[PDB]
Structures are given as C-alpha cells and as structure tokens.
Design a protein around this ligand. Structure first.
Ligand SMILES: [Zn+2]
Lengths: 217, 1363, 63, 32, 26
C-alpha cells in the first residue's frame, strides 16, 4: 500500500499546516457558533471578537433573527463581494449615466448654450436608453484622437453611429420662442415633413400655443 | 537672537485662537467647532491686547460682525495687485530699477560666456523686447505687489519675534484693504460696499457666509459702519506673501521662454495662466475651505491629459473620463450644501474646461502639474481630521485564511532564496525533514528549487525552522538616536500641552519634550538596555501609555496626521526599524525597476522569460497608492510576519510593540488651544469619547513600521507573479508604487495588436492584486488606478514612452530672497538660491529664463538685508555704519562676480550647467572671474581681486577645508558658533556616551592629529582629510553637526553683541577690495598666464605658516573648459542658417540619426530618444555584517598603504590609528584588503578615492542619441595616460552637455546631423611624476581611550560569518 | 490489515473533506485580539497581570 | 523495526484526531 | 517502509499539539 499511504501522508501534512495557521491567527478569543448566535439575537449586533464563517455568502447574511438590519459585519462582506465581481476587460471602465455622459461632452465644447450643447443632451439620452453608451463614448474619443474638435466629432457621430439611424428628434415644451437660448435663435427653422437626427435636425420646440420650430445644425 | 520667525510658511493653518481675540474686542467670530472656546475665560496674554490705543483707532467705524478669511481672499489678492504701485516710497530702498539692471547684465554675460565656450558666435540672439528695462514692470502683473509684500513681510517677522510689548505693531493703509499686525495676529479691513456689490443682502452675494449667519437680517449691524473686518494669524499673511512670489516667478519664466522660442516652448502659454489663476481665486472665495476639494484635482487632470498621447486604444481615455466624473460629483455636493444656483457657480465649470480644452503638448502639461500650491492652503479642524482616521482604524475586516497563508509562505521563501544566492548554501534547518518532502531532497543535495516549481509545493514552507540570522547587538549607524525628533509627554502629565484657561482647571502635574535635549539627559543609554526594555514589556507600565497626533504643513486635504510617542518608546521604535533595515529588509527589492524603453534588448528578453531569439517584449504599468495601507493593517494578518521576524533575530517580543501598545492609548491632537471637547477635572484620569478624541485604535500609523509593511507588500506582488505566470517589476517612491508587466510576442505582430495585448495582461495582474489585497483588508480603489502602456513614475520624475518630461517650475517657483539660516546670513540666502538654480537647470531645456530669476533674487537679498536686518535696531544701514558712505552699484556687482572660494559672494558658476561635481573649484573659479572681468571691460582688476591678505588659520582648518584658501571672507558662520555649542555639551550633558566622546582633553587630540597628518615631506591635503574623517575626531565633528540644529544649546545679552560684530566684520571683507591687498602677492602673480600656475602659487602662499616650506601636491587640477576646446567638423544645411554662419589628440562626438520614440514630433532634440548609452562604458575575505567602525578602519589601512612606499615601516604607523577603532591586530586586517599595487600616487589618488559626476547636468534624453568616442586622443587612450592631468570620465559628460546646450533651441528635422570634436590644449596638461609620502615619525598621542563607546569602538569586530 | 484498510478509508475521506472546506473559509476581525496577546505575553514574562489592568477588564480579556 | 508496529498503533490515534477535529469544526464555524 | 512510519509518527505528534490549541478555544 505504498501509494495509498504516501498520498495520505502528504495530504495530512498539508491539512495540518493550514489548520494550525488558522487557529494561531484568530486564537483564544474567537467566538464559537452558539455564543455568536446568542449575542447577535439578544443585542442586535455581532460581538467585538473574531469569528469564523463557512462562506462569504454566510457572512453577508448574518443578521438578527427578529429583524433584518445591516451590521458592520455585513457591510464588510458586501464590500468584498463587489471586489470579487471585477473582471479584467472592465477594470476601471467608466460607468456613465445619461446625465453624467452629457456633463463630459459639455466639458469638451466651447462657448455656452450653443446648438451643440442641445445636441449633446439629446444624443446622450438616446444612446443611454438603447444601452450603447460605452461604444458611443469610445467612438467620440477616437474621433478626438484623430485630431478634430468636439463639434466635428458630434456631427460625424450623429450621421454615422448606428443607434441614431432613423430616430425622430424629441419634443421640448416651451412658453414661447423667447425662451430658447440666445445663441440658438438664428438656427431655428420650419418643421420639415419627416425630421430625423441623421439628417441634421436636433430637436423640436413646441410653444404653448401650438407653434413648432425645428432646430437645425 | 539665534532664532527668528520662519521666513516661509512651514506649519498648518489653525485659526482657533482668533476666536479668543475677537471675543476680547467685542466682535463676533465662529472659526472653531470646539464648545470650550465659546465660554472659557480669555488667556491673559491675549486679553491684554484690547488695551492698545493704536488698535482701538484702527477699529473705528467697523461693524460688530466679521467674515472668514477666504471670502476676502479673492479681493485681497486683486487689491494688493492693483494698488501696490502708489506706495513706492515705502520701499524706495530695494532700488527696483537696479535689480532689473543687474539681472539683464548677468544674462548678457552668460550669453557671451557660452558663445565663447561652444565655439559658435551668434548661437544666442537678441529679442530686444526682453532686454529693455521696462519689460517686467510693464508686462508682469505681480511685480509691484511682490516687492511690497517682501518689505511688509520683513516688518511682520520683526513684530512677531518680539515677545509682546503692546506698542510693537505695524500697519498698511491702502485704497482698500487696510492691514494691522499685533503680536500673533493680522487684521484685514475692507469696505462693506465692495463686498455687497449690488445684491439683496450679504449672504445673497456670498452664499458661503450662510455657515456663520444662517438666515438673519444683518442690515441693522451694517448700516452705520463703512468697514468690515477679518481676524487672522501671522501664517495667513506669510502664505499670501508666498503666493505672490510664486506667481511672479512663474509668470516671468513663462513669458521669457515664449519670447525665446515662440513656436514651441515647454511652458504653458500666458492665456492659460491668467485664466487658471483668476478662476481658482473665485472658486476659493465662493466655496471657502472646500474649494480646495475642487482645486485638488489639478494634478490628476494634468496626468490624465498626458496619458492620451500614444497610439489610440480606448483604455487611454478612461483615466481622464474617471477624473472628469469625479470632479462634477464633488461639485454636486458643494452646490447642495450651500444652496448655490447653477448660474452662480460658473467659475468651477470654467476651471475644469480651461484645463481640458487647452490642447497642450505633454511637456506643457507636465510643467502645469507644478502649479498645485499656487492658491494657498486650507484651514484645518482637528475633529474633521480625526473623524476620517477614527472610522478607518476601527472598522471591521473580512479576511480569507488561504490568501494570508500563501502570502506568509512566500515571505519565508523569499528570505531563504536570498540567503542561498548570497552564501551559496542553505541555512541550518532545525525542523523535522519528514514534514516537508519536496524541500528535503533539495536540502540534502544542497540545491535550490526553480521559480517554476515553487507554487505547487508552496505550503511546505510553513514548517521550515532554522537558526537565528542577523545578530542584534550591532547596528551600522548608531547616530539615528542623536538626531532631532518630536516626542509626546508621559501619561501622568498629558494635559500639560494645553492652555490652562481654555481647559478650565489647573493640571496637577506639569512637565521638557525635544529628542536632542532628552538624549543628552538620559544618564545610561546602553543599546542592550533598550533591547531589554522591549523584551520585558516594560512599556506596558501606565506611565508610557500616551500617544498624540499632529497635523502636516502644506497640503490640500482635510488633514494628514503624523504621530508622536513618549521618549523611551521612540527609542524602541528607532532600534527596531534600524535592525530591520540592516538585516532583513535587504532580501526584498522594492526599487528593482528601471524604465523598460531605455533597457537593452538582451536584458529584457532574459528578464521577461518565465523559465530561462526571435521575440519582442512590450511592457505596461499601473500605479497604486501606499498611503492608505497604514490604517488597514490588523493583528490577525500580521501576527505571523512579526513572529517570524522575532525568531530570525533571536529576540522575543521586540517587533510587537506597536500592536501591543497602540490600542491602550487615548488618541487626540495636541493643539494648544483645542483640548478634547469633554475633559473636566474629575473626568481627567479616564476621559470619554467625543469629537476630538477616542479609544481603541486597531490599525497602524503613518511611519511606525514602514519597513515591515513594504516587505509584506513585496511578498504579495511575488505571490501574484507565481499565480499569473507573468514577470513583474515593482518600484517604490515616497507614496506611489508602480508595477510593470512584461509580455512576450512573436516577431511578426502588428503594433496595434501588441499595444492591446500588453494592457490586457497588465489588467489581469491588477485584478489579481486587487483580490489578493482585498482578502488581507487593504482595498485598492480601481477608480484612481490607471493602466497605461507608456506613462511611468521612476525617480521623482515622469516618463512617457521613455522620453523624460520637464519639471523645472516645481523647484524654480520657490526661489526667494531669504532662507532659513542663523541670524539671517547673506551667504545662507545666496547659497540656497545657487543650489535651487542648479537643480532647476537639470530638469528643463530653457536656460536663460531661470537664470534671470536667480540673478534678480540675489541682488534683492543684498538690498533687503542692507537696510532691514532683523538682528539690528529698526533702521540701521549696515553699509553706512561700516564704510561711512552708501554702497554703489559697481561695488555690489563686483562682490556678486567674485567666486566664493576667493572670498566673494558668487554662487552661480556657469560651469555647473555642464556637471555638478567639479574636480577643483579654485581653477574653475579663476577661469570664470577672468571671463567676467573681460566682459565688464575692467581687465586690470584681476590681480587685485584675487590677491587678498591671508588670515590666521591653524592646521585643523586646513584639514577640514582641503581645497580652499585661507581668506576670512570664504568662511561660513557656523564655524564661529561651534565653539559655544561644544561648551554647553560639557555642562548640560549626563549621557555617558557623549561624556566619553567629548572627554576633558579632546581638543589637544584634535590639534595633535591634524598637525601630524600634515607632517609628510610632500603634503597631500586630500589624504589628510580622508584620514581625519575616520579617526575619533571625525566622529566628534559629525556629532557636533547633528546637535547644532537646536535651541538653548546653540543659543546659550553678550550673544547679540558677538553676532552683530561678526556680521559687520563680514560685510567689510565682502564689499571692500582695496582694504584687503598684498601688493607683493599681486606683483608675484602678474607673471603667470595659465590658471594652474596661478592656483598653485595662491595655495602655496596662503598656507605658508602651516606648510613650513614643504610643497603641496594632489590639490590642483585643470579646468575642463580651459583644457579642451570645441571645434565643429560638420553641420547640416538647415542648422547653418539658424546659427548665422557662412563658410593630434581629441574626443569625437556626433548625433545619432536613428530615432526610437518621440513626443510630440521630431522637431526638438529633447523631444526624442535613441539607442545609445555612453555612460555605461565608463578581496580574499569579506564579513557578512561589518560594522561602521570596521569599514572605516579598512578604508584607513587601504589609503595609508597605498600612499606610502613598500620599503617603509608601515605597521607602526598603522597601529596607533587602527587601535582606536577596532580590536584586530595588524596582520588579520590585511586579509580583507582588495587588490593593490597599481597606480600613480598623485594622479591615481584623485580617481581611485575622489568623488566624481557620473552624468551631465542636463535632461537625460540627449545622452540616448550621442555617439562619444575617446579612442582618438592618441597616447592618452597606460603610457603617459596614467601620468597626466586628463580625467577621461569627464570628457564624456562635457561632450554630451555641449551637444545638448548647442541644440536646445534649434529646429531639427529628419535630415539634420551634427559632428564635432573636443581638442586638447597644451597649456594646462602637465606630467605629474609618481611620488610617495615620507613620514619620519609615528603618531605620538594616546588614541586608545574609547573601548567603552560602542559609537566609536568595535570590541569584537568579526562575530558574524567570516564568509 | 483489514482494520488498517478501514482506518485508511476513513482517514482519506476526512482529510479530503477538511481540505475542501478550508478552500472556502472566511473570518472577521475583532478588537479583542491584540490586547489578549499583550496580556498573555506579560503573564508569561512576569507571572502577574499588568499594572492598571482595568482597561483589559473593559475589553473582556483579563481572565 | 519498532516503527512498523508503531505505525500500526498510530493510525488509530490519527483516526481519533481526525474524528475530534471534524467534531470541533461543527462548533467553531458559523453556517446559518 | 521505515520512512513511512517515521512520517506517520511526526504527523501524529503535530496533530496532538494542534488539537491542544483548538481545545483552548472551545
Ligand atoms: Zn591653461
């Protein structure tokens, strides 16, 4: 029985090392399972002593039996699970909401309250709704790296990016045509038959009295 | 007298005591969050200031309300900037037009010097716009404000220095913004109308004021009064002065650079500066202290813009995206905390947009990164500061035993592997072999397992036990205890650090605190007694359970703390860190990195191969922060590392001190005016938790166990490397840690494919490391981490794809007229300016813009100290008291031209643009002086200025200053105070080590040893200095140097008179040259023409009394710029037009045409790199652990053997010197000497034991494209080469520096090439015959007196392994 | 020999079970670890509890 | 030679240790 | 076969010590 004995010798030595390290690391004050459960149920928070759990998921679920309330121990486990969710294709990848994406585009544009600011709001909302915000941001950045400015990048993205083909411009409710921003007044036009974004129509301003003006860029 | 208030800002800005001044004047203020200050009784030294009549008239027609300091900050800067020109009569001295005149003259001089050296006329031309006198006054917006604040800051230093007289004050009355300075405070006074500015109310105009006055009708308090007041401290005023000086220097350097180049200059343009400066000021005014949260983002934003420059990959824009998102989040919080409308906060959006939308080059972003501190610093609150620390150090962590287990086993493996590759064998195991099978048959056969198979059998390292290593009773330095440190008080008297009136009771026990004053007070101080103290756990006594924090000086966060321990616990910490740094921290390479684009291909292939050429290597790096590690360490994790260290040193309980002691203390900040919120008289022994203070700290603190934590970090990186099977190289700066992953590709791979795959591999590693540290309780935050293919921090510098980027402003913007010296010394100030200038040139490619600033501030120091010295009465005029008439422009100029070695005040040597270490300062100084006098047209003054009357100096002065002259003016001020410091040591000292080192007859020993070292038949001063540094006299001088920077030791009326008389004498010697003359010496010198002959004659004449007719050797070496001349062989056609030119032994230099990397283009030489590396071209026994004493004894024996002759009686000269350091006999020592018996004594001493420069003082990009060849200089390439003046390591530095300086502004192309040669001249080369020193008498003094000092003596020199 | 075959078959099952469980364990830290270690080190060195031991009673360690 | 007999005796002691440790693991480790 | 016996005895030794440490906790 040499093989069936040598395998047992090596496995036993390894098991011995690992469990000896564990007991020395948390020793002499660690709370056993019964005492831990009693303290938690009776006080509502876990004891100030070290404890040993079977899995990370068991630690995420350690709460008082009577009511479910988060405790310092639970928070520690949730932080660690969020770390475990990391993947190496999306390490430090920016996650941006529609409002958040718009703020970035504004940082790259010159002036204030120009037609390109309205175009940026509209495009960011449409792209985020269809779940293509990361691809949209990467395409914008690529055009910037080629050597162009943000305005040419936005016009080219409106023409070619897939999420905007055959999309009707949104409608904005205003009191009158004095409410539209001053730099955008000169670009207002009459509503075309079938407006669409990939042809250069940003949005539709509808006044309080049914008068509609189309913004052209 | 010795100490004065600090010239520059070095302390945190705390405004607690201001609340106490306002309550005593009847005003309202709410700086502090501490409720003790609302109702305590005012301290008497503050309450008495309300009685001054000057302060009561200054406060007439003011409101009861005050405003915080920053809400005014904006208006203060603007008002001083625009109003300072109407107050020129206040600083009519300082002669502004003369400052500009001197600086212009100095640039013209340096241009002439460099045109002559480089051999090309007209390399440097005239932009007549920078050269007119009216350029800086008319076009720099900070000129007049800077001069006014230099004057006012000197007044403020004088008033604060006086201990409080109630009549000592200063004031300044302007169009707006009146100022008033009293003991510790400065009061700013502004009209109300300029703050309201046509708004509904005061809070409507400045919303940040809602914190003090929530919503109250303030108009009843503001109608009848025309002014409003802000109370602040002296540090706020000094910080304003610092901001003006920094902004002035920065604007001037940028403006001049853009006139010099005008196409691409490596400095941000002036549009960007004007915009950023104004918008940051507005952000600070509006958001007060918080604004710093937004302004703190300037540095990461600059880095993120640099990173977007290589070959496009989406990941290259991720860091920038993360930073932008982070910036607006902060804004969204601030706008809800102050209820700010979107239209009000336009300044914050303009700040971020100005940075991003400016499309600068990587060089300009790297320089703009340096403007981080140009807006001032925030106010700190100790409760806000300690909330963050408390939360992080009391939190609970979730740890995984498997990860902790594996990183511990890797720790033990690293130690074992380093031992084996050092001593060729396994250490002596004492554990049972049966437990670990894989390791047993490697131990029995004395072989070490390979890197590949280590992971499979990793567990077996848990059982390995062995014999102790690293004996404890010896540490190398033993001078770390003497050094200055800050300590806390003992726990019986822990209240004594607070004010009695703020506390509300008188503490029962009152306490000294400084380390230099407490090391001298300790009567015994053994080193074994500290060990015993730790081993017996003596500290756990109730007396040593106090710990206190203190805040850091110049940062932009809410407050970072460094900790302070009682005196004896500080000794325990110091001993543990020293033991670790010598013995075991050596097995962990924490700086193994070098920049991979600059490394040879063969080395990369060998290093990046997992096991052991047709392969391509591409690296990618990421950066992590080590600052957030300290508070996250828990005992459950570090028990095992600490226990294994205890075993490795044989000691027990030594490395556990921090985790055993820190959780038993009461954590608080020791601010004089902010005690813990809730401490009372009966509550005092066991106080409770409150906002300031708390119990049960569970983590570490910033610097307590730095060595051990860095070792654990290296162990986790090695564990990750075993897990991912990729080669890693890590490096540690002060704060950041950079990790580089090396990946291998086939030869036929597209460049885009390599760029993408390298970043993917670096990301696998970053994810793995994040998990490994998260299961140890330390959380990397992926948002502030970036992964990049080109960007790196390596030294304190930044590289992009191997191209070094400039960082010159960081050091040149802090240039100023005054520095921190003793009694406001003029040489101290000028020397500080000179060193800052030489570092600044090493980090850029523009020379003249920085040189103008350095010269400007030199002349300014002279004028300011002439008429506003702090050590004299208020108006004194040093020059009138000395010479009976004021100084002229020409006299000041001649002092600033004469080199310091000759007794003048010139510290900006042009030769230091080429290399820092100059072989001989006398010959180079003579070369520079001759050139300057030829430019100035006063060529007849040369022999008058160099021939000055020798002073009275002993032999010890000549031994301490080997290469200098005996002139009174070149001597430093500290040499006049040293004698006093030594006297106090023999009065106030009880330390046994110090009393034994400074025994009763030590002065006679120093005198006798110095006289003996200069008694050889040819005298050699370099040899004498080298020997003197290692005898007990050198140790005595080192200890004096450590203890000098103290108070009441250096200080201890008649001291003021001694210092005043010394200062007047020094001014007479610097600024009068007809008074100091030897007509005989000048008559003798006029015959020589070479600078070497002149230096030899001056050294012989100056030290005639010491030399006694013998002749001096080994000191004079030729100046390189006079020995070699530059001759141009071939220049391309596009450079001939730019240099405006129309058409044997030598070193040959050329420019390499092949370019490897470039950013942004190939148009400047400093924007590109190449392949070359010209700097790379240029013991039978050994003890494992040699102490410092043994190293120095070996060096002395080596030097003295090499100097004397073989047929001599060498042993009897060696015994008296060697018996004073170690216990070996003579014969055993020779067994450690390396190979000898080759050299030429005069020549080979300088190169064998001298100190050289390993590189040119330029940016390191040029060296990578230089082809230097020293094969063509004939018979000097060892025939007459070992027997000449030439140093062949310095010609390479000169060749690289000439190539760099000549093409610093030229516009390059793909067709340009350059080749020249450095030609040898005959005047300076000498043939130095081989010569021996003959000692006719052994040393007759008993140097054997220090067998009790372990600081000096090694009782058992070889107790470690013989090896 | 048969008693040995049965004991080995029990031992291998137990050992594999322990190692599989060890792969998934996780622990949490507490504040009583370092003070308990300090208390034990002082008794081992001197034989009596450390002076002003009241703090150790507050942490629940002195026993 | 004593070792073979000792090995026969020890396996019983090792089995007892394993049973005791399987017992202690059920009380130490939280698994709710 | 002697090496096996020695290894088993060593393993038994360690088991006894590591069981004592666990006995302290419960
Ligand atoms: Zn010469």
């Amino acid at each position: 029985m040499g093989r069936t004995l040598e395998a047992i010798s090596k496995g036993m030595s390894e098991m011995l090392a690992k469990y000896d390290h564990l007991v020395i690391s948390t020793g002499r004050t660690t709370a056993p399972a019964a005492a831990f459960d009693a303290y938690l149920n009776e006080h509502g928070v876990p004891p100030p002593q070290p404890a040993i759990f079977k899995d990370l998921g068991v630690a995420q679920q350690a709460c008082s039996k009577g009511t479910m309330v988060k405790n310092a121990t639970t928070d520690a486990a949730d932080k660690m699970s969020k770390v475990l969710e990391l993947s190496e294709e999306t390490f430090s990848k920016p996650n941006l909401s529609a409002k958040d994406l718009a703020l970035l585009l504004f940082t790259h544009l010159p002036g204030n309250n120009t037609p390109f600011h309205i175009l940026a709001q509209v495009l960011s909302k449409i792209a985020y709704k269809s779940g293509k915000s990361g691809a949209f941001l990467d395409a914008f950045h690529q055009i910037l790296s080629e050597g162009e400015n943000a305005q040419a990048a936005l016009t080219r993205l409106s023409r070619t990016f897939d999420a905007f083909l055959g999309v009707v411009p949104p409608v904005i409710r205003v009191k009158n045509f004095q409410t539209v921003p001053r730099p955008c007044q000169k670009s207002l036009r009459a509503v075309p038959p079938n407006p669409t974004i990939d042809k250069g129509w940003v949005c539709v301003y509808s006044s309080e009295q049914g008068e509609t003006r189309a913004l052209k860029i | 007298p010795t100490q004065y208030p600090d010239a520059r800002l070095s302390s945190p800005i705390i405004l607690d005591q201001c609340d106490l001044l306002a309550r005593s004047l009847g005003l309202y203020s709410h700086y502090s969050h501490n409720p003790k200050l609302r109702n305590c009784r005012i301290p008497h030294h503050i309450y008495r200031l309300r009685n001054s009549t000057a302060l009561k008239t200054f406060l007439q027609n003011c409101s009861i309300l005050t405003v915080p300091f920053h809400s005014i900050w904006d208006h203060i800067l603007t008002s001083i900037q625009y109003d300072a020109i109407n107050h020129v009569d206040d600083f009519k001295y300082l002669l502004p037009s003369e400052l500009v005149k001197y600086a212009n003259w100095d640039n013209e001089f340096l241009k002439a010097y460099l045109n002559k050296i480089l051999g090309l006329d007209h390399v440097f031309s005239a932009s007549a716009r920078s050269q007119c006198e009216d350029f800086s006054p008319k076009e720099n917006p900070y000129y007049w404000g800077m001069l006014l604040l230099v004057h006012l800051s000197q007044l403020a230093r004088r008033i604060k220095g006086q201990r409080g007289s109630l009549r000592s004050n200063w004031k300044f009355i302007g169009t707006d913004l009146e100022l008033f300075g009293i003991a510790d405070f400065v009061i700013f006074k502004v009209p109300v109308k300029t703050i309201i500015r046509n708004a509904v109310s005061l809070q409507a105009s400045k919303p940040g004021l809602r914190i003090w006055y929530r919503d109250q009708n303030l108009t009843p308090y503001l109608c009848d009064d025309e002014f409003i007041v802000s109370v602040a401290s002296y540090e706020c005023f000094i910080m304003i002065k610092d901001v003006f000086i920094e902004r002035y220097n920065t604007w001037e350097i940028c403006a001049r650079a853009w006139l010099e180049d005008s196409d691409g200059a490596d400095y941000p343009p002036l549009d960007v500066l004007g915009e950023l400066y104004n918008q940051g000021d507005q952000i600070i005014a509006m958001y007060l202290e918080d604004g710093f949260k937004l302004i703190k983002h300037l540095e990461p934003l600059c880095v993120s813009c640099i990173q977007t420059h290589g070959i496009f990959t989406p990941r290259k824009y991720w860091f920038q995206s993360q930073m932008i998102k982070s910036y607006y989040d902060e804004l969204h919080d601030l706008n809800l905390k102050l209820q700010i409308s979107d239209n009000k906060a336009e300044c914050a959006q303009n700040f971020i947009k100005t940075i991003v939308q400016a499309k600068l080059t990587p060089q300009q972003y790297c320089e703009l990164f340096s403007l981080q501190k140009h807006w001032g610093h925030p106010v700190l609150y100790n409760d806000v500061a300690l909330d963050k620390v408390k939360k992080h150090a009391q939190s609970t962590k979730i740890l995984k035993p498997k990860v902790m287990f594996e990183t511990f086993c890797v720790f033990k493996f690293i130690v074992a592997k380093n031992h084996y590759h050092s001593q060729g064998s396994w250490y002596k195991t004492t554990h049972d072999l049966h437990l670990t099978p894989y390791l047993r048959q490697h131990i029995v056969s004395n072989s070490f397992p390979s890197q590949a198979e280590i992971y499979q059998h990793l567990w077996e390292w848990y059982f390995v036990e062995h014999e102790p290593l690293f004996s404890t009773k010896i540490i190398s330095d033993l001078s770390i205890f003497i050094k200055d440190r800050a300590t806390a008080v003992n726990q019986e008297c822990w209240d004594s650090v607070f004010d009695r009136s703020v506390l509300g009771y008188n503490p029962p026990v009152r306490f000294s605190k400084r380390v230099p004053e407490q090391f001298l007070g300790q009567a015994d101080f053994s080193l074994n007694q500290i060990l015993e103290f730790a081993e017996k756990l003596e500290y756990l006594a109730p007396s040593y359970r106090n710990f206190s924090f203190s805040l850091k000086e110049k940062e932009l966060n809410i407050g970072r703390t460094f900790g302070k321990l009682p005196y004896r616990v500080r000794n325990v910490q110091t001993l543990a860190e020293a033991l670790l740094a010598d013995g075991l921290a050596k097995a962990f390479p924490s700086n193994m990195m070098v920049v991979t684009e600059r490394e040879q291909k063969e080395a990369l292939l060998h290093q990046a191969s997992w096991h052991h050429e047709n392969a391509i290597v591409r690296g990618a790096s990421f950066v992590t922060d080590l600052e957030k590690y300290n508070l996250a360490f828990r005992y459950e994790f570090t028990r095992h590392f600490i226990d294994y260290c205890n075993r490795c040193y044989g000691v027990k309980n030594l490395f556990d001190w921090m985790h055993f002691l820190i959780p038993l203390c009461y954590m608080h900040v020791s601010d004089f005016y902010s005690p813990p919120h809730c401490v009372t008289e009966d509550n005092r022994n066991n106080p409770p938790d409150c906002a300031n203070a708390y119990h049960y700290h569970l983590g570490g603190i910033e610097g307590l166990q730095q060595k051990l934590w860095t070792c654990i970090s290296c162990a986790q990186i090695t564990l990750v490397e075993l897990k991912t099977k990729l080669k890693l190289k890590s490096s540690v700066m002060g704060d950041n840690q950079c990790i580089t992953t090396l990946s291998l590709f086939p030869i036929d791979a597209p460049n885009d494919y390599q760029e993408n795959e390298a970043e993917l591999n670096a990301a696998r590693v970053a994810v793995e490391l994040a998990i490994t540290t998260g299961y140890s309780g330390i959380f990397l935050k992926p948002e502030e981490t970036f992964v990049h293919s080109g960007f790196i921090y390596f030294g304190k510098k930044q590289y992009l794809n191997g191209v070094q980027l400039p960082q010159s402003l960081k050091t040149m913007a802090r240039c100023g007229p005054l520095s921190d010296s003793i009694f406001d010394d003029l040489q101290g100030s000028l020397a500080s300016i000179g060193t800052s200038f030489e570092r600044g040139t090493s980090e850029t490619r523009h020379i003249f813009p920085s040189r103008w600033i350095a010269s400007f501030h030199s002349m300014l120091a002279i004028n300011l100290l002439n008429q506003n010295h702090l050590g004299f009465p208020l108006g004194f005029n040093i020059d009138i008291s000395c010479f009976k008439k004021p100084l002229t422009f020409s006299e000041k100029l001649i002092a600033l031209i004469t080199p310091q070695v000759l007794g003048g005040l010139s510290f900006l040597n042009p030769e230091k643009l080429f290399y820092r270490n100059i072989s001989d300062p006398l010959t180079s100084g003579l070369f520079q002086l001759k050139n300057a006098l030829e430019f100035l047209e006063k060529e007849e003054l040369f022999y008058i200025l160099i021939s000055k009357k020798p002073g009275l100096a002993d032999a010890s002065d000549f031994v301490m200053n080997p290469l200098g002259l005996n002139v009174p003016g070149s001597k430093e001020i500290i040499t006049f105070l040293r004698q006093t410091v030594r006297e106090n040591i023999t009065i106030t000292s009880q330390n046994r080590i110090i009393n034994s080192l400074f025994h009763i007859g030590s002065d006679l020993e120093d005198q006798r040893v110095c006289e003996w070292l200069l008694s050889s038949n040819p005298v050699m001063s370099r040899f004498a200095a080298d020997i003197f540094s290692r005898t007990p006299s050198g140790k005595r001088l080192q200890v004096l140097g450590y203890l000098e920077g103290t108070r009441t030791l250096l200080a201890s009326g008649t001291m003021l008179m001694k210092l005043r008389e010394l200062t007047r004498n020094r001014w007479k010697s610097w600024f009068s040259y007809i008074d100091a003359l030897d007509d005989d010496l000048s008559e003798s010198l006029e015959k020589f023409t070479c600078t070497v002959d002149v230096a030899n004659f001056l050294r012989a004449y100056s030290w005639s009394d010491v030399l006694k007719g013998k002749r001096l050797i080994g000191a004079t070496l030729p100046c390189l710029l006079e020995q070699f001349e530059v001759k141009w062989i071939n220049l391309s056609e596009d450079l001939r037009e730019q240099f405006n030119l129309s058409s044997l032994n030598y070193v040959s230099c050329a420019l390499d045409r092949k370019v490897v990397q470039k950013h942004p283009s190939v148009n400047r030489l400093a924007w590109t790199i190449g392949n070359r590396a010209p700097y790379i071209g240029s013991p039978p026994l050994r003890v494992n652990c040699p102490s410092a004493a043994l190293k120095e004894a070996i060096e002395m024996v080596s030097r003295l053997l090499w100097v004397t002759q073989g047929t001599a009686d060498r042993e009897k000269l060696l015994i008296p010197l060697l018996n004073s350091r170690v216990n070996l006999d003579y014969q055993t020592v020779l067994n450690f000497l390396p190979t000898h018996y080759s050299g030429n004594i005069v020549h080979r001493y300088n190169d064998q034991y001298g100190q050289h420069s390993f590189m040119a003082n330029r940016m390191s990009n040029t060296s990578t494209r230089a082809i230097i060849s020293t094969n063509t200089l004939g018979k000097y390439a060892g025939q007459a080469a070992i027997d000449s003046n030439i140093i062949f390591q310095n010609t390479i530095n000169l060749g690289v520096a000439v190539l760099d300086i000549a093409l610093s502004l030229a516009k390059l192309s793909s067709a340009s090439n350059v080749t020249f040669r450095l030609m040898l001249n005959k005047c300076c080369t000498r043939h130095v015959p081989s010569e021996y020193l003959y000692f006719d008498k052994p040393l007759d003094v008993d140097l054997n007196k220090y067998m009790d000092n372990e600081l000096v003596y090694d009782n058992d020199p070889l107790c470690s392994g013989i090896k």
